[PDB]
């Protein structure tokens, strides 16, 4: 509709390149250095999953959109990355650490105003300083994270709202320094529910390695265009046109991955997140079927995040 | 300016005269005067590869009450072309666009306004807020306690202090001779209606304003030759700040600040290319700011170089290598005997091989 035949042909030619994914990783945030896995995760979130209606099953609409949590020291690439995502993504929202009731002056009737979360429906919402937020708001966040809906019962007003948004959150450890400990709560002090709801958690640690400081300083003092402009329309085309579906081989691979993962501890929600990541990678390759490569890459990324 | 007035500015030691010309009524604190002069000049603004960098210099001066911070702020408010002088409670950022916002009693303000100050510091925007922030602060207890940490004594977040490119501590340390000199200077200022007679009479306010306006007009370009030296110096400073736990977090902001200082110095000296002297002066200023908070041995080394996996060394090779280094054979023999006394090695009676014990 919005693309001519030559644009589709160019997109197919680019997709036929096996390196495009990594190249697209190089395309995202050129000013940010040595965060390739983070760029890969951001791209996968941009692709997201596929929407499925389970009305015949009697089950609620399962979440099909990816959320990523970032934690580290302030002054790092958090704010710049959040601004980059907000600027690049249409309908993006930027917030710092909901619906409300307004009196109509004409009919004296209480009408509803939609907060930024509702306004960013089908878009991406990014939040800075997650740790420093009030507990009431974080209690509200559980429903939008899980069911993608939001119910209000206040002053006789009872309503339900759709909140199809992706949360990209940045947080600061409580010590303001990575104290050598074991669990992420020991450094960040977050409840298990919120952590379990996140699909991907990444930690930004400034290593005490001299060569890394050399590279950072050189990148700063020395501080592509063909990619992001095409990529916006490419992502729109992928969202509108293709949807992957699961296969038997990927079924067996995911079952084995789950049974192996639980030995480390594991919840079915991480299995759902792995399915979503496989769908995202299949969309990345513009493949209508989910194969072994998607599952293997998703498991690799998850295990890399867990190891770090 | 009239170019003759620029020459009247360009005598010998003109940098020192310009530094002293700012608030000469307050004795000492030449480093703070240089910092304020560089704030008046300011760095360069660039927008490379889609990101905007700041050239504005924001300085935080903290000290015990009575160190003449308010008078310095009033003087810099008077001298700056666009200047907005404000207090903690009494508030301005937009009004001082392309100017200097001098704010005092920073430590005596609620955190809600402080939160909005961070965006202004980081992006110079609110609307645009492209202004140089000059903040004044006092210790929580009225006296600076070196035992307590800097953040506790300032009761401000570490990020806010990091966003300030320069921090200057002034302590009222009691010294008898310094106290007498300060007292006599105050007496002379009070009686004679004037500053005490220094080596050179300070320049007029209008002349300094015009000079700053002209120096702001130039945009020096950083040569690529000094980049390696700048990286080495930044590495040394960051290593030092990592070894010391009480030092401020030397992130990218420190490198940006020193680059801004070098560009401001280049603008001050009216040169389109930044030289190594500007970099050295910036390093000196940053270091001062952070401080406010025998032939026998040579011949032994020469023959040690020939111990690459061998216990015995030929006499002729060692002699030739020592002579090639600029030592006469007599000194070689003397060093050999002196290190032979120390039971280090034994020389063959034929003087052909030496066995290292």
HSE-up (13 A, CA, CB side) for residue A271: 16
H helix or E strand, kind and range, residue B74: helix B69-79
Q: How far apart are CA B232 and CA B240, in angstroms?
A: 12
Tokens of A150: 């939001």
**Long-range residue pairs from B7-12, CB within 8 A, at least 24 positions apart, any chain:** B8/B203, B8/B207, B9/B203, B9/B207, B9/B211, B11/B200
Instruction: List CB contacts (< 8 A) between A31 and chain B.
Output: 49-51
The contacts of residue A256 (CB under 8 Å, 6+ apart) are none
Give A75→chain B minimum CA distance, Å. Answer: 7
Tokens of A67: 């959320």
- HEC string for chain A: CCCCHHHHHHHHHHHCCCCHHHHHHHHCCCCCCCCHHHHHHHHHHHHCCCCCCCHHHCCCCCCCCCCEEEEECCCCCHHHHHHHHHHHCCCCEEEECCCEEEECCCCCCEEEECCHHHHCCCCEEEEECCCCCCHHHHHHHHHHHHHCEEEEEECCEEEEEECCCEEEEEECCCCCCCCCCCCCHHHHCCCHHHHHHCCEEEEECCCCCHHHHHHHHHHHHCCCHHHHHHHHHHHHHHHHHCCCECCHHHHHHHHHHHHHHHHHCCCHHHHHHHHHHHHHHHHHCCCCECCHHHHHHHHHHHHHHHHC
Cα distances (angstroms) measured from residue A238 to each of A41, A207, B74, B300: 17, 37, 61, 73
Tokens of B245: 């736990």
Q: How far apart are CA B166 and CA B257, in angstroms?
A: 8
Main-chain dihedrals φ then ψ at residue A247, nearest 5 degrees? -120, 175
Give B231→chain A minimum CA distance, Å. Answer: 7
Inter-residue contact A133 to A191 (CB < 8 Å): no
This PDB structure is determined at a resolution in Å of 3.8
Identify which of B288, B293, B202 has the alpha carbon closest to the alpha carbon of residue B29: B288
Q: How far apart are CA A42 and CA A67, in angstroms?
A: 9
Q: How far apart are CA A178 and CA B261, in angstroms?
A: 32
Of the partner residues A30, A208, A217, the one whose CB lies closest to the CB of residue B242: A208
Q: How far apart are CA B80 and CA B218, in angstroms?
A: 18
Q: How far apart are CA A246 and CA A225, in angstroms?
A: 35
**How wide is the angle at C-alpha A108 spanned by C-alphas A102 and A111, nearest 5°?**
35
Q: In what order do the strands lie in the sheet with B131-137?
A: B83-86, B99-103, B131-137, B59-63, B166-170
- HEC string for B171-193: CCCCCHHHHHHHHHHHHHHHHHC
Tokens of A118: 């509702």
- Between chain A and chain B, the number of residue pairs with CB atoms below 8 A apart is 39
Q: How many CB atoms lie within 10 A of CB A228?
A: 16
* DSSP 8-state code for residue B205: H
Measured over all CA atoms, what is the biggest interatomic distance in chain B, rounded to whole angstroms? 93
* DSSP 8-state code for residue B48: G
Cα distances (angstroms) measured from residue B104 to each of A177, A251, B62: 31, 66, 10
Give A223→chain B minimum CA distance, Å. Answer: 7
* C-alpha radius of gyration, chain A, whole number: 21
Domains of chain B: 3-286 (3.40.50.300)
Q: How many CB atoms lie within 10 A of CB B149?
A: 12
Inter-residue contact B34 to B19 (CB < 8 Å): yes
Q: Does B158 touch chain A (CB under 8 A)?
A: yes
The position carrying tokens 């601004």 is A83
The position carrying tokens 């929407």 is A51
- Residue of A75, A96, A129 for testing the chain B interface, max B β-carbons within 10 Å: A75
Q: Cβ of B49 and A30 within 8 Å?
A: yes
Q: Cβ of A210 and B239 within 8 Å?
A: yes
Instruction: List CB contacts (< 8 A) between A75 and chain B.
Output: 159, 162, 249, 251-253
The position carrying tokens 């579906």 is A245
CA dihedral A185, A187, A190, A191 (to 10 degrees): 20
User: Per 3-state DSSP, what percentage of chain B is helix, strand, and coil (rounded to 5)?
Assistant: 50, 10, 40
The per-residue b/e assignment along A241-262, b for 16 or more CB within 10 angstroms, e otherwise, is eeebebbeebeebbeebeeebe
Q: Does B232 touch chain A (CB under 8 A)?
A: no
Helix (H, G, I), strand (E, B) or coil at B349: coil
Identify which of B257, B252, B219, B49 has the alpha carbon closest to the alpha carbon of residue A218: B252
Q: Cβ of A220 and B252 within 8 Å?
A: yes
Identify which of B77, B195, B78, B79 has the alpha carbon closest to the alpha carbon of residue B136: B77
* C-alpha radius of gyration, chain B, whole number: 28
Helix (H, G, I), strand (E, B) or coil at B29: coil
Q: How far apart are CA A194 and CA A88, in angstroms?
A: 27
H helix or E strand, kind and range, residue B355: strand B353-356
Inter-residue contact B125 to B56 (CB < 8 Å): no
The position carrying tokens 């594991």 is A266
Identify which of A59, A96, A54, A57 has the alpha carbon closest to the alpha carbon of residue A74: A96
Q: Is A197 annotated as a binding residue?
A: yes
* DSSP letter string, B104-158: --GGGS-HHHHHHHHHHHHHSB--B--EEEEEEE--TTSS--SSS-HHHHHTS-H
Angle, helices B315-324 vs B295-304, to 10°: value is: 130
Q: How far apart are CA B252 and CA B238, in angstroms?
A: 10
Inter-residue contact A11 to A234 (CB < 8 Å): yes
Cα distances (angstroms) measured from residue A147 to each of A69, A116, A150, B205, B229: 18, 18, 8, 67, 56
Which residues of A lie closer than 8 Å to B, measured between beta carbons?
A: 30-31, 74-75, 79-80, 176, 208, 210, 213-214, 216-218, 220-221, 223
H helix or E strand, kind and range, residue B69: helix B69-79
Q: How far apart are CA B114 and CA B158, in angstroms?
A: 12
Main-chain dihedrals φ then ψ at residue A199, nearest 5 degrees? -75, -45
Q: Which sign does the torsion angle of CA B150, B152, B156, B160 carry?
A: positive
Helix (H, G, I), strand (E, B) or coil at B3: helix
Of the partner residues B49, B158, B239, the one whose CB lies closest to the CB of residue A223: B49
* DSSP 8-state code for residue B221: B
* DSSP 8-state code for residue B87: -
Helix (H, G, I), strand (E, B) or coil at B166: strand
Q: How far apart are CA A82 and CA A85, in angstroms?
A: 5
Main-chain dihedrals φ then ψ at residue B307, nearest 5 degrees? -110, 30
Q: Would you call A153 exposed, middle or buried from its count of C-beta atoms within 10 A (0-12, 13-18, 19+)?
A: exposed
Q: How far apart are CA A193 and CA A216, in angstroms?
A: 36
Inter-residue contact A163 to A150 (CB < 8 Å): yes
* DSSP 8-state code for residue B333: H
Helix (H, G, I), strand (E, B) or coil at B273: strand
Of the partner residues A75, A213, A223, the one whose CB lies closest to the CB of residue B235: A213
Instruction: List CB contacts (< 8 A) between A80 and chain B.
Output: 51
Paired with A152 in beta bridges are A159
Give A109→chain B minimum CA distance, Å. Answer: 34
Q: How far apart are CA B165 and CA B263, in angstroms?
A: 14
Q: Cβ of B255 and A220 within 8 Å?
A: yes
Tokens of A8: 């589709």
Q: How far apart are CA A31 and CA B49, in angstroms?
A: 8
């Amino acid at each position: 509709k919005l693309f001519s035949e030559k644009r589709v042909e160019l997109l197919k030619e680019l997709s036929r390149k096996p390196d495009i994914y990594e190249r697209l990783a190089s395309a995202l945030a050129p000013s940010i250095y040595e965060h390739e896995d983070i760029k890969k995760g951001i791209l996968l979130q941009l692709f997201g999953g596929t929407r499925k209606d389970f009305s015949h099953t009697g089950r609620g609409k399962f979440r099909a959109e990816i959320n990523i949590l970032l934690c580290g020291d302030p002054g790092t690439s958090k704010s710049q990355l959040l601004q980059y995502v907000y600027n690049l993504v249409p309908r993006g929202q930027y917030t710092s650490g909901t619906a409300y009731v307004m009196k109509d002056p004409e009919t004296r009737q209480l009408v509803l105003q939609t907060g930024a979360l509702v306004l960013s429906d089908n878009g991406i919402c990014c939040i800075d300083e997650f740790d420093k937020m009030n507990e009431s708001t974080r209690s509200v966040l559980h429903e939008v994270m899980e069911q993608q809906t939001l119910s209000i019962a206040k002053a006789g007003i009872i309503c339900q709202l759709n909140a199809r948004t992706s949360v990209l959150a940045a947080a600061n450890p409580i010590e303001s320094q990575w104290n050598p400990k074991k669990t992420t709560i020991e450094n960040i002090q977050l409840p298990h529910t919120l952590l379990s709801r996140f699909d991907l958690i990444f930690l930004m640690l400034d290593p005490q390695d001299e060569a890394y400081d050399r590279r950072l300083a050189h990148h700063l003092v020395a501080l592509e265009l063909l990619d992001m402009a095409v990529l916006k329309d490419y992502i729109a085309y992928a969202h509108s046109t293709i949807m992957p579906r699961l296969s038997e081989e990927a079924s067996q691979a995911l079952i084995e991955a789950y049974v192996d993962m639980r030995k480390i501890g594991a919840y079915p929600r991480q299995l759902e997140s792995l399915i979503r990541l496989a769908e995202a990678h299949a969309k990345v390759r513009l493949s209508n079927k989910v194969e072994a490569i998607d599952v293997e890459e998703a498991k690799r990324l998850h295990r890399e995040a867990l190891k770090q | 300016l009239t170019r003759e007035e620029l020459r009247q500015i360009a005598e010998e030691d003109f940098y020192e005269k310009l530094a002293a010309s700012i608030a000469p009524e307050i004795y000492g604190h030449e480093d703070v005067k240089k910092a304020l002069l560089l704030l008046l000049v300011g760095g360069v603004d660039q927008s490379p590869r889609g990101m905007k960098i700041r050239g504005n210099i924001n300085i935080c001066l903290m000290g015990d009450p009575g160190v003449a911070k308010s008078q310095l702020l009033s003087y810099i408010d008077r001298l700056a072309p666009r200047s907005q002088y404000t207090t903690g409670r009494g508030s301005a950022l937009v009004l001082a666009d392309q100017g200097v916002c001098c704010i005092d009693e920073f430590d005596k303000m609620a955190e809600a306004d402080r939160t909005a100050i961070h965006e202004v510091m980081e992006q110079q925007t609110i609307l645009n807020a492209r202004c140089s922030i000059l903040a004044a602060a006092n210790p929580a207890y009225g006296r600076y306690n070196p035992r307590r940490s800097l953040e506790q004594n300032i009761q401000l977040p570490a990020a806010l202090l990091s966003r300030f490119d320069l921090l200057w501590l002034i302590q009222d340390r009691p010294d008898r001779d310094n106290d007498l000199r300060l007292a006599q200077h105050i007496t002379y200022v009070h009686q004679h209606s004037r500053q005490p007679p220094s080596q050179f009479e300070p320049l007029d306010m209008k002349l300094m304003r015009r000079y700053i306006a002209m120096c702001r007009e130039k945009q020096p370009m950083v040569p690529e030759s000094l980049a390696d030296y700048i990286t080495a110096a930044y590495v040394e400073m960051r290593r030092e700040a990592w070894a010391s736990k009480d030092a401020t977090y030397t992130s990218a902001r420190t490198l940006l600040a020193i680059l801004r200082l070098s560009t401001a110095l280049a603008r001050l000296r009216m040169v389109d290319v930044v030289e190594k002297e500007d970099v050295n002066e910036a390093i000196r200023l940053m270091e001062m700011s952070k401080d406010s908070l025998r032939p026998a041995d040579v011949i032994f080394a020469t023959v040690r170089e020939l111990v690459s996996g061998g216990r015995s060394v030929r006499f002729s090779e060692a002699e030739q290598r020592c002579v090639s280094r600029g030592f006469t054979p007599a000194q070689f023999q003397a060093a050999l005997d002196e290190y032979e006394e120390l039971n280090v090695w034994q020389v063959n009676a034929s003087r052909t091989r030496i066995t290292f014990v």
